Design a protein around this ligand. Structure first.
Ligand code: ALF
Ligand code: MG
Length: 219
């Protein structure tokens, strides 16, 4: 049986994406750039903060110094951090708390394998800290998803090899990272985004211990 489950955070445990969207809206409003709506936000999907900022400046063909650029990125992050103070246990996705409990009671290791710089904070706000054996620090990995570094770090932190683990992800790039770590991926979302060579569930309520066992055995 698998010995560990390696969890991505956004789109698996909870959604941060709305707070991000709203942080950018506020920044855009503050600096007087029209066009930062939900539709435009699609183009900020898994895009870095600096690249996202660039797309926003591009809406008004605005040019800035390196220092102004840096300051604007900082302000968006300040907004974001402010907005996430109200994350609560009610923002835990469906199925996830029960999975954590079942994994822990079956002595299966639990690790966070997220690029969120606010991982420990958000887990604490959702009252989930006690279930985690480890959080792989994204500041300490050389390369982000689709590189496997973060999943490898996560597995190692709980005393296992990636090959003894399941990885849970909502992004193609994350799925690819899990593959390359040697862990077994189970995606959540649709095959359009994720690929169709891996097991995928439609939402997180399908992530149960029973289902993960099913998948592990058939592999
Ligand atoms: F929290 Al993620 F890819 F969604 F690191
Ligand atoms: Mg994700």
């Amino acid at each position: 049986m698998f010995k560990a489950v390696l969890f991505d955070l956004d789109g698996v445990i909870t959604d941060t994406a709305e707070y991000h969207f709203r942080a950018w809206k506020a920044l855009a409003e503050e600096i007087g750039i029209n066009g930062v709506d939900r539709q435009f936000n699609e183009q900020l999907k898994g895009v870095s903060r600096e690249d996202s900022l660039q797309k926003i400046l591009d809406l008004a063909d605005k040019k800035v110094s390196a220092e102004e650029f840096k300051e604007l990125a900082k302000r968006k992050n300040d907004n974001y951090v402010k907005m996430i103070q109200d994350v609560s246990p009610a923002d835990v996705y469906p199925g996830i708390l029960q999975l954590l409990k079942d994994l822990r009671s079956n002595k299966i290791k639990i690790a966070l394998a997220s690029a969120s710089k606010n991982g420990p904070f958000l887990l604490e706000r959702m009252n989930l800290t006690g279930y985690f054996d480890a959080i792989a620090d994204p500041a300490e990995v050389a390369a982000s998803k689709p590189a496997p570094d973060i999943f490898i770090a996560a597995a190692h932190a709980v005393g296992v090899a990636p090959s003894e683990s399941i990885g849970l992800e909502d992004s193609q790039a994350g799925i690819q990272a899990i593959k390359d770590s040697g862990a077994l991926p189970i995606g959540v979302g649709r095959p359009e985004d994720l690929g169709d060579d891996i097991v995928i569930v439609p939402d997180t309520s399908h992530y149960t211990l029973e289902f993960l066992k099913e998948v592990w055995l058939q592999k």
